[PDB]
Every structure is written in structure tokens, then in C-alpha cells.
């Protein structure tokens, strides 16, 4: 009846995205009084005129910013009955499993946030394993769209495949009827390569989401809308409240079938060169982050238009779209079929804000608290234990507080193979 002491090891998880994403811990008192949010400035872009006399043409200065906040603690509250053999045993294997589960949850939230707030969308009409070097073409498309927009890839880039498409890429490499070094490695091991098509890190992630198709159809922009970059705006009291730059709310005819995470593209708008403002040949892709009302959505890249007439030059310096929405633009939906997502990003686009839970404080007497270290990820939470003689059951809790933020959604991406029909 009683069991031996050898654990049948059954699962083994890996957390590559959470390991790779940077971690940020802002000061605790400042966050407490600041409501667990903190603003960071965005790199300044300057306008430029041409001419000799510039009377009354002096511009001003503008410096936009973004905000990073935190959500709710992820706990493993559990109970310990006094008179139980099953509870006396395994109450340490439970702690180990809690650590692994908490790290897994962190990685899952990172992957979901990246997939549902990635603006750059690469799509394909067929599966990866159909034509030759199609997986390389996918990774290269990601790299080329990041290069054309002149994004900041200074601190690294990364491409995450799902296991099925990783196997498709490996199959494409081995079926070559040749064996050099890349085919030999992709045949012996399953690994395609570590650097592919320009990215300096190409991994396979086991828990990328599935981006279910969007049933939205026949939606049009309702009224001309112009979005203007600001750093702050005045509220009802005259107080200047900061304005976030990575969101913009837009009114459409009817937002039916839309949800958080669908990828859209208005018909007519195009990407710019960001730094040089040279019009690209690639349609601007946006991602909806919230469906508010029945006629509003929130899209993460704010479409500052270059041809806008109401924009001051210091605002037009931040343009990222060639033209503005014009009351009839048909909005196309890019995810027209279910498919597990591949996710690419610049390595400094996702961060993990972290805060302590000061339960070691003297106010929390009676309960015993330790620092708890979740593995793989560099996160620390608390491990607390208490017990009420009323029910004669010790209560054990493990808490750890974090918030995943996408500071640059214009750098995060989503690869969508086989988006036909």
C-alpha cells in the first residue's frame, strides 16, 4: 500500500521565451504610490525643413512615452490536513511542482502577450512543408519586414517556431538529396540551425498559442479619423495626464467577430521607413488589443499618417503610415484560418516587470515567509506558511507577482502559415 521513494518523472517543461525576455524591477515605494505603473520615454524623432528664410517656422519639441504596469499575483495556495499520511508525504513534491507550474505560467503569459500584441504580421497562402526552402522564406520575410521599417535590432532578435513547423523546416532541409553540414546536422539532430536568414536566435517553443480565425467580414471605417502623437493631455481638472503611445482607439462600422488578437490591415495605407519616411510596398498591419463597444476597437500601432494636414511638423516626424483612414477604407482581416503561430521579435520588445510582496514584515506575525525562487526564469516570490488550530490544518501559500509588457509592439511579430481561404 505505502509507496517506495522513487519518483516516476513524467513531465519536463522548458521556458525559452521567459528565459530570453528581460526582467525589470522598479523601486517598490515609488511603484506603490504610483499605482504599479511607470512611464518610459520613447526615442525622439525630429522634423526637418528645407529653405533659407524660416520666419515663424520654428517648431517645438515632442517626446512620447509608454507605460509598464503589473497584474495580479499567481498563487499556489494549498492545504495540509494534520492527520493524513498522504498530506505528510508529498508536501515537498507539491512545492517543487508549484515552482515548475509558476515558471510555466510566466512563460505562457509571455507567449500569449507576444502573439496577441505583435503588430508585424507575416502571412502565407500554404503550409510550410509544401515548397522548397519555404521555412527559410518565412524567417527571411520576418527579417526583411523588420529591416525595411528600420527597427532597432541592436540587442538581438529571435524567432520562435512551433514544434510542427520546426519539423517541417527540418524535413525541408533533409529532403535535399544532399548532405553537407547543415543537412547532416538537421538529419542527425532535428535542429535546422541556430541562426537562420539573419536572426541570431531561432528556437522552437512548445507553447505558442493558436490564433483562431476571425469571422469578421464586411467591416469598413466609419468616418475619417486622424491619430496624433501626444505626450500628455489635459483632463477635466486641467491636470496633464500622460498619454500612451502604443494604442489607438478607432471606430468601425461594426466590430462583430473581432476579439483581442486579430490582425487587420486597412486597404490603402502602407508602411513608412520610420526614420526616412520612405513609403514601403507592404500594407500596414495592425493588431486589435481590445474590443470596446460595438463600433470601437483598440489597435496597437497608432496610425500616424504622413499626409495628415492637422499634424504639426513635430508630430508628423513620428509618422508611420502613408495615408490616413478615410471613412470608407475596407479593413481586411489577415487571420482567415486557424493556425498555430510563429513569433518573432526584437529582444528588447518584451519585458517582465516584477515586484516583491513584503510579507516578511512584522505586521505579518504568526506566518513564516521565505524567498521562493522559480527556476529557469529569474523570478523570486514568497513562500508563506500559517496554520489555524480551529481546523487543525496548516495553510501553505506560494505567491509571485509580475507583469508582462510589450513596450514595442511594432517590433514583435506573428508568422501565420497556410492562411488560405
Amino acid at each position: 500500500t505505502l509507496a517506495v521513494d522513487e519518483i516516476i518523472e513524467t513531465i519536463s517543461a522548458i521556458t525559452p521565451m521567459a528565459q530570453k525576455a528581460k526582467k525589470y524591477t522598479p523601486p517598490a515605494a515609488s511603484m506603490q504610490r504610483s499605482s504599479n505603473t511607470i512611464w518610459m520615454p520613447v526615442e525622439q524623432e525630429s522634423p526637418t525643413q528645407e529653405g533659407w528664410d524660416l520666419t515663424d517656422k520654428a517648431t517645438g519639441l515632442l517626446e512620447l512615452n509608454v507605460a509598464v504596469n503589473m497584474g495580479e499575483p499567481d498563487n499556489d495556495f494549498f492545504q495540509l490536513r494534520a492527520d493524513d499520511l498522504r498530506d505528510e508525504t508529498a508536501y515537498r513534491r507539491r512545492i517543487q511542482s508549484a515552482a515548475r507550474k509558476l515558471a510555466n505560467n510566466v512563460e505562457l503569459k509571455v507567449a500569449n502577450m507576444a502573439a496577441e500584441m505583435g503588430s508585424l504580421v507575416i502571412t502565407s497562402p500554404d503550409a510550410i512543408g509544401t515548397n522548397t526552402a519555404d521555412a527559410w522564406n518565412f524567417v527571411a520575410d520576418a527579417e526583411e519586414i523588420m529591416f525595411s521599417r528600420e527597427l532597432n535590432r541592436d540587442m538581438g532578435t529571435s524567432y520562435f517556431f512551433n514544434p510542427q513547423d520546426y519539423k517541417k523546416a527540418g524535413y525541408d532541409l533533409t529532403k535535399r538529396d544532399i548532405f553537407g553540414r547543415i543537412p547532416e546536422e538537421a538529419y542527425r539532430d532535428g535542429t535546422i540551425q541556430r541562426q537562420v536568414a539573419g536572426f541570431d536566435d531561432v528556437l522552437r517553443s512548445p507553447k505558442l498559442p493558436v490564433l483562431t480565425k476571425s469571422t469578421a467580414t464586411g467591416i469598413t471605417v466609419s468616418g475619417a479619423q486622424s491619430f496624433k502623437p501626444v505626450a500628455w493631455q489635459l483632463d477635466n481638472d486641467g491636470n496633464k495626464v500622460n498619454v500612451d503611445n502604443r494604442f489607438a482607439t478607432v471606430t468601425l462600422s461594426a466590430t462583430t467577430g473581432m476579439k483581442r488578437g486579430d490582425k487587420i490591415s486597412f486597404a490603402g495605407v502602407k508602411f513608412l521607413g520610420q526614420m526616412a519616411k520612405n513609403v514601403l510596398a507592404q500594407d500596414a498591419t495592425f493588431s486589435v488589443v481590445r474590443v470596446v463597444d460595438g463600433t470601437h476597437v483598440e489597435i496597437t500601432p497608432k496610425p500616424v499618417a504622413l499626409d495628415d494636414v492637422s499634424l504639426s511638423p513635430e508630430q508628423r516626424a513620428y509618422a508611420n503610415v502613408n495615408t490616413s483612414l478615410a471613412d470608407a477604407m475596407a479593413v481586411n482581416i489577415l487571420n482567415v484560418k486557424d493556425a498555430r503561430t510563429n513569433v518573432f521579435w526584437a529582444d528588447d520588445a518584451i519585458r517582465i516587470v516584477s515586484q516583491p510582496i513584503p510579507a516578511n514584515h512584522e505586521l505579518f506575525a504568526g506566518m513564516k515567509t521565505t524567498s521562493f525562487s522559480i527556476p529557469d526564469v529569474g523570478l523570486n516570490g514568497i513562500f508563506a506558511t500559517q496554520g489555524d488550530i480551529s481546523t487543525l490544518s496548516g495553510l501553505c501559500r506560494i505567491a509571485l507577482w509580475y507583469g508582462v509588457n510589450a513596450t514595442r509592439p511594432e517590433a514583435i511579430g506573428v508568422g501565420l502559415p497556410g492562411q488560405t481561404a
Binding site: 524591477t25 521565505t370 526564469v377 488550530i389
Partner: protein
């Protein structure tokens, strides 16, 4: 492939392979230092008397005092065929930088933990000292390791009592918040990024827990053949110096001063690297440290392997069952004394109806009265008076209390004496001397004694840094064990006294008495006596 991947795999293998011994040693430490009621679920199961009638702690105190009355220290002796004074300078350095309080404290902590749990340890580190250096503006000092059983994780594939053949070893550091801040300042790390590591106490005893920060240090030893340059000494002979030690600093300064290269050989040696790690990344990757050995010295009690599993045991592990039984039985007997009705008479209410103030306890009456008649039965039934029986301790409780006490008495007898424990401590001190010798050869300035004086050969680089120049003829003294002395003068005084105690009263006895006077400390009168002895010895040729 990743460096962290490999390091963590090695650490996890060792951590799982040393799992049962570490948990038993932690149980022994908690039993012998915190409480003998080491159950944790019974912290919320309704209060019952739980006494602590301890009989093992006096034995631990006796053994600790016995091991404290006989200190043991390293003693370097010249090798066979070496010059007769090949160890005096190294012995002087060892005494100088081991006479401090930290060395003795580390040894005493390790010995106490060896007696109680079965394993202890200490560490040898080097620091830059300016005011009172030992040599080359540096000191070699010894630091303690508390709870070495759970804090020092050795290479699993190591089958020696002193872990000489371990290729790596990870030591887990736990520190408060201010401690982590100072640690980060010292090692140039990042203070914002709070580090994390596997909890040394695992999760046994979920109480007795503090807000502490864990980090790890991973030492590894690499044995390889490296290049050694054989120069010709401008004074005499030819010294051999490693290329890795004067690779860029003085590689041309040697020639400029007048050292001419003779040859070039490949000589096998061990180099030790230290890494600072967390569970997620390496903060310092492969920082090379001085010496040829891992700087940790372990002390063991009863040690062995059962089936490829290392088991160590002190003096507390076996007595635990008898002591727990004794505590339980004493608690049961205390409950018997406390919650038990006392001896009082059994009465019917009608037997004393009206006379109940006679029995309350006062002494105001000369006798006790009882009612005799009843209006229905005519006469009350006559039954002999009965008293509630006196509380008693069961024969089983008494017998098993004696048996448990006797069993603990039988089993808590180390040796007949602590000869085996002292021999294991001597083995640890020999390993300490080995490690210290290597570190001294690596960082200190060791002069060479010519038979033609000491010849310290050193030269500085363009960055004003002085590089030690130690020849490859360095291992000239071997380690030994001897009485602990604070200084070379104390050792010499002890030697002269020992010789005096065996030489009869003759000319050697006169010479040794004058020598002992010569080697005395200085006041005024001892100054006069020492001057007299010096002059007599000089005059006697």
C-alpha cells in the same frame, strides 16, 4: 551545450545523489540544537504536554570539550633530502595568517558540526590587505561554513574522505538583504537583480525560515599541460616559471632585467576556476583563483560508502530513538500527574446530608458524623467507605523509561574517547596544509635559500604591478600535524622545552637552558636574563 546547462546538470546530479545523507544530517542538527520534538504537523493539533528531558546533549558537550582541549594544527616539515630549514618560512607565513580568530572559529564550528551531524567544512580565501599584509600585499585567511551538510555540495564521483579527487564543488551562500548588497559591491555584480538558488534547507522544517537571498559559487579543477619557460637566473642556476603567470606582464621585463630564455617545456598542473551562478544565469563565468585545489576542506565523523552512496554519522543519529521514547514517556507521566482525580471518599448525598461542612477540609471538629436513618427504608444501607485510588505510574511506563535511558546511555559512547574524530580532523588539517601550500606558491613571495641567504627575485610591469616569481622547485616541505602554536617563537620555545625535558643535567642541559632564556619575550628583567644568556652563548663559541 550551454555553460549554465552543464553546470546546473552537474549540480543537480550531485544534489540528488547526496539527498538522503543531507536530510539525515539536517535532522541531526535540528534534533541536537533546536528541539527533540521535531514533528511539524503537530504544531496545530491541540496542545498537549511535550516535555524536553534531554540526556544526549551532555554527551555532545563532553565530546566537544574533549576535542577542544587538544588543538591540532598544520606542521610543515622538510622533505627527504631537502635542506634542513626548507619549511621555516612557509611555517612562519602559515602561523602569521592563521593566528587570527576567524581560523580558530572556523575549525571549532566544523568540529562541533562533525560531532553532532557528521560533516562540517571550512573555506580558504585570499584577500588584498594593505596595513598588515603577510606577503605581496595579500593575506590567506580561513572562513567558516555553517550547515556544511546542506551548504557544500561535492562532486558525486568522489570516493575520498577529504574529497581530493572531486573535480568540482558548489557552495551555496545565503545572506540577508544588506549582505547581498555588500556581496554585489565586492564582486562587481548587479544589486538590483536579486539572485536565486536552490534552498539549502530544501523544505524540511518549513518553520525556522528567514528572508534570505541565495547565490552559488561553483569551483572546478582542470588538470592540463601548460607551457613553462626555463630562464637562466642572472645570479645562479636556472628557474622555471609558468607562461600563464608572466604571459604579458613581465614577459619582456625578465629579459630587460637580464633573464635569458634557455628552453621551453610543457608541464602538467591543476588550475582552479570559480564561478558565481544563480538558477538562471552565470554572473562570473570562469574567474581563475589561486591554488591547485578546491579551497574547501571537509571534516567527517563516521564516514563510508554503502552502495555507491556516501553515509556519514556523528554521535546523535543513533540515540534519537531512545531519547524520543524517553521524552514521550515523561510527557505521558506528566499528564498522569496533572490530569487525574485525587483520592477523595465516595459518598451518597444522604449519608452526609446536613454534615457537609465537616468534610470540606477544615480542622474545627473532633470527628466526622454520618446520617444513619432514612424515612423509607428505616436504616441507611451499610457499605464500607471507599476512596478514589491514588494516581500511579504504570509498570510499563517506568520500565520503558529506564530501558530508553539505558539504551541512550549504551549507544551515546563515542569510542571507548575521540581518537577517530581527532584523526579525521588531522586528515582535514593535512588537506588544509596542502591547499595553503599551493595558494602560497601561487600568490605569495617565497624566497629561495642559497647556500653561498634568501634571494627574492621579483620585477614590476609597466602598470606598476608586481608579479611574484616562484621557481618550479617549490614543493620542498610536506604537511604534517602538530600542536597548535600562535607563532614561530612559541613553536621554538616549545621545542626547546621538549628537548630540555628529556636531556639529563649536563652540558646539553646548560646549553638548552641558556637557549630557552634567549628565546624569551621582553620586559626588563627577562631582558637582563636574555642578554646574560646571549653573552654566555656567544662567549662559549
Amino acid at each position: 551545450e550551454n555553460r549554465l546547462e552543464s553546470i546546473l546538470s552537474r549540480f543537480d546530479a550531485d544534489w540528488t545523489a547526496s539527498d538522503e545523507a543531507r536530510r539525515e544530517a539536517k535532522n541531526d542538527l535540528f534534533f541536537s540544537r533546536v528541539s527533540q520534538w521535531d514533528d511539524w504537523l503537530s504544531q496545530y493539533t491541540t496542545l498537549q504536554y511535550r516535555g524536553q528531558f534531554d540526556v544526549v546533549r551532555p554527551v555532545v558537550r563532553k565530546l566537544v570539550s574533549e576535542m577542544r582541549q587538544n588543538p591540532i594544527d598544520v606542521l610543515y616539515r622538510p622533505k627527504d633530502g631537502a635542506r634542513p630549514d626548507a619549511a621555516d618560512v612557509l611555517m612562519g607565513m602559515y602561523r602569521t595568517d592563521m593566528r587570527h580568530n576567524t581560523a580558530k572559529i572556523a575549525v571549532n564550528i566544523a568540529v562541533r558540526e562533525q560531532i553532532e551531524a557528521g560533516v562540517g567544512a571550512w573555506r580558504l580565501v585570499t584577500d588584498y590587505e594593505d596595513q598588515s599584509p603577510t606577503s605581496n600585499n595579500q593575506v590567506i585567511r580561513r572562513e567558516p561554513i555553517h550547515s556544511a551538510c546542506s551548504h557544500v555540495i561535492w562532486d558525486s564521483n568522489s570516493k575520498l574522505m577529504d574529497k581530493s579527487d572531486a573535480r568540482h564543488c558548489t557552495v551555496i551562500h545565503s545572506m540577508s538583504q544588506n549582505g547581498w548588497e555588500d556581496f554585489a559591491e565586492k564582486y562587481d555584480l548587479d544589486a538590483d537583480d536579486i539572485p536565486s538558488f536552490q534552498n539549502p534547507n530544501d523544505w524540511v522544517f518549513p518553520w525556522l525560515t528567514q528572508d534570505t537571498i541565495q547565490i552559488a559559487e561553483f569551483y572546478e579543477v582542470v588538470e592540463k599541460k601548460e607551457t613553462a619557460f626555463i630562464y637562466q637566473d642572472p645570479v645562479t642556476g636556472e628557474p622555471v616559471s609558468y607562461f600563464k603567470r608572466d604571459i604579458k606582464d613581465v614577459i619582456d621585463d625578465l629579459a630587460d632585467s637580464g633573464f635569458i630564455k634557455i628552453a621551453e617545456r610543457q608541464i602538467k598542473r591543476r588550475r582552479v576556476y570559480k564561478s558565481i551562478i544563480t538558477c538562471t544565469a552565470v554572473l562570473k563565468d570562469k574567474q581563475l583563483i589561486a591554488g591547485e585545489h578546491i579551497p574547501i576542506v571537509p571534516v567527517f565523523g563516521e564516514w563510508g560508502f554503502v552502495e555507491d552512496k556516501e553515509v556519514y554519522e556523528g554521535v546523535v543519529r543513533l540515540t534519537k530513538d531512545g531519547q524520543r521514547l524517553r521524552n514521550m514517556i515523561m510527557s505521558f507521566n506528566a499528564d498522569i500527574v496533572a490530569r487525574t482525580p485525587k483520592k477523595k471518599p465516595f459518598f451518597w448525598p444522604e449519608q452526609i446530608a446536613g454534615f457537609e461542612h465537616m468534610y470540606d477540609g477544615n480542622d474545627d471538629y473532633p470527628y466526622y458524623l454520618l446520617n444513619r436513618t432514612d424515612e423509607n427504608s428505616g436504616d441507611l444501607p451499610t457499605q464500607p467507605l471507599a476512596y478514589y485510588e491514588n494516581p500511579e505510574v504504570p509498570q510499563a511506563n517506568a520500565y520503558m523509561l529506564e530501558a530508553a535511558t539505558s539504551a541512550v546511555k549504551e549507544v551515546a559512547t563515542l569510542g571507548v574517547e575521540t581518537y577517530v574524530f581527532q584523526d579525521n580532523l588531522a586528515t582535514a588539517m593535512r588537506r588544509d596544509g596542502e591547499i595553503y601550500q599551493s595558494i602560497v606558491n601561487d600568490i605569495y613571495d617565497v624566497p629561495r635559500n642559497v647556500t653561498i641567504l634568501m634571494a627574492e627575485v621579483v620585477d614590476l610591469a609597466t602598470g606598476e604591478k608586481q608579479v611574484l616569481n616562484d621557481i618550479r622547485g617549490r614543493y620542498e616541505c610536506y604537511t604534517d600535524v602538530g600542536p597548535s602554536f600562535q607563532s614561530m617563537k612559541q613553536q621554538n620555545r616549545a621545542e626547546i622545552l621538549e628537548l630540555l625535558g628529556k636531556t639529563p643535567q649536563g652540558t646539553p642541559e646548560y646549553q638548552l637552558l641558556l637557549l630557552q632564556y634567549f628565546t624569551l619575550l621582553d620586559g626588563k628583567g627577562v631582558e637582563m636574563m636574555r642578554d646574560y644568556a646571549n653573552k654566555q652563548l656567544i662567549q662559549m663559541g
